[PDB]
Design a protein around this ligand. Structure first.
Ligand SMILES: Nc1ncnc2c1ncn2[C@@H]1O[C@H](COP(=O)(O)OP(=O)(O)OP(O)(O)=S)[C@@H](O)[C@H]1O
Length: 271
């Protein structure tokens, strides 16, 4: 079962780049604009499943389109008619790079300074989104890439539908910029320690832990991590949104302090 060689007459597919729970991403040439793009398409094997067809249209295809250097731009969406059936797709900015999920998997924890740099840049992407009224809602290692020229790129903003969810998302409360802060804190935790804050035999077990259980401070999970870093990470991961960083920009400012070896403003954490 293949994905067609073309999507409309416009997009000529090249190499496969990646795949996920519901889609496959291909490098493509836009023949109209002479541009290499990434085309995300419903996976060829799941393509006959109505439940996935629906998810793809309602979720993947609804990624918000934002113009920022740290955000993967969304160019186009559509549906190709395939001998098998209608095949939905979304066209976006091509990133020659690797997701943070892959980096952690293949290389282990990032050095602390590199981790701070990467997450500080993610904060800029989130600030821009928030300033433009969009909550990301699904910040996770899989939604952040680093390019071959070391630029951070954040993707797949503003979609509806456990390792990275905020307590409020677990509870069905209001989700806001502070929920994105929390979830980015989880990512930061994971790139520093090599492990996410909470692991469980199920998503309900992980959700429970987000609501109810204190994360182990990063310096307890892994060597070379300071108490200043514990302080920043543990603030982003506060259960009560009022005790977290209130904005992505407030979080970034403490990251930049720690990068420059200045004390963060986050409450001290002792171990
Ligand atoms: N902008 C893009 N440029 C290059 N590669 C990309 C791009 N977007 C996605 N990829 C690659 O394609 C893979 C799959 O994309 P995802 O968005 O994770 O798939 P998905 O099935 O829509 O996601 P979920 O959240 O698993 S359902 C990623 O891990 C990347 O390797």
């Amino acid at each position: 079962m293949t994905t067609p060689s073309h999507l409309s007459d416009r997009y000529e597919l090249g190499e496969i780049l990646g795949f996920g729970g519901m889609s496959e991403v291909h490098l493509a040439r836009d023949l109209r604009d002479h541009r290499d793009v990434a085309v995300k398409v419903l996976r060829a094997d799941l393509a006959r499943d109505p439940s996935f067809y629906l998810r793809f249209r309602r979720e993947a295809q609804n990624a918000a389109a934002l113009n920022h250097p740290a955000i993967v731009a969304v160019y186009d969406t559509g549906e190709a008619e395939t001998p098998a059936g209608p095949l939905p797709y979304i066209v976006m900015e091509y990133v020659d790079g690797v997701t943070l999920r892959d980096i952690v998997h293949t290389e282990g924890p990032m050095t602390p300074k590199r981790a701070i740099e990467v997450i500080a840049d993610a904060c800029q992407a989130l600030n821009f989104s928030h300033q433009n009224g969009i909550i990301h809602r699904d910040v996770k290692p899989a939604n952040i890439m680093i390019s071959a020229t070391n630029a951070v790129k954040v993707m797949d903003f503003g979609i509806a539908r456990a390792q990275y969810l905020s307590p409020e998302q677990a509870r069905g409360d209001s989700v806001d910029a502070r929920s994105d802060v929390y979830s980015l804190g989880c990512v930061l935790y994971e790139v520093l320690t090599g492990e996410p804050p909470f692991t469980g035999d199920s998503p309900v077990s992980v959700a429970y832990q987000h609501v109810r259980e204190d994360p182990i401070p990063p310096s307890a999970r892994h060597e070379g991590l300071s108490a200043d870093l514990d302080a920043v990470v543990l603030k982003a991961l506060a259960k009560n949104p009022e005790n977290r960083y209130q904005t992505a920009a407030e979080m970034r400012a403490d990251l930049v302090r720690v990068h420059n070896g200045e004390p963060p403003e986050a409450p001290k954490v002792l171990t």
